Amino acid sequence: KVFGRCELAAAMKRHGLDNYRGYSLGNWVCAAKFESNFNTQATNRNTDGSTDYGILQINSRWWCNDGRTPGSRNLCNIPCSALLSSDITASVNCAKKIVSDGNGMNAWVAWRNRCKGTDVQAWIRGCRL
Ligand code: NA
């Protein structure tokens, strides 16, 4: 599913992500636009052989099992394919674990390079929240 901007904000808000670990909703919507374009089905391969899955491009070296990333962990205890659902629950739940891990949202490269330090409240402007 390809979300609209406000539709995804609302979804993220309902799943408790606004101000999770001190990260406002705009930061999460901005991260999702630059990671996936707001596509749940987005997959990207990494040079190391791991793969990033879903709206928030979560990586199978640490976080999910895809059966084809040797030696990897599965901290979120989910198949990577479940990160591709139209229902974002599993992605949000796993992203709460990731941002908790010590580096905050800097775990998402496109957040650090394209969202950090910018006016991220623009990403939720206009929305009925
Ligand atoms: Na894995």
User: Which method, experimentally, gave rise to this model?
Assistant: X-ray
Q: How far apart are CA 121 and CA 88, in angstroms?
A: 21
* Residue 127 identity: C
DSSP for the chain, written as a single string? -B--HHHHHHHHHHTT-TTBTTB-HHHHHHHHHHHHSSBTT-EEE-TTS-EEETTTTEETTTS-B-S-STT---TT-SBGGGGSSSSTHHHHHHHHHHHHTTTGGGGSHHHHHHTTTS-GGGGGTT---
129 C-alpha to ligand 1 centroid (Å)? 35
Domain count, the chain: 1
68 C-alpha to ligand 1 centroid (Å)? 8
Range of the domain at 66: 1-129
80 C-alpha to ligand 1 centroid (Å)? 8
Burial of 90 (0-12, 13-18, 19+ CB in 10 A): buried
Q: What is the resolution of this structure in A?
A: 1.2
For the annotated binding site, the residues are 101
CATH number for the domain including 43?
1.10.530.10
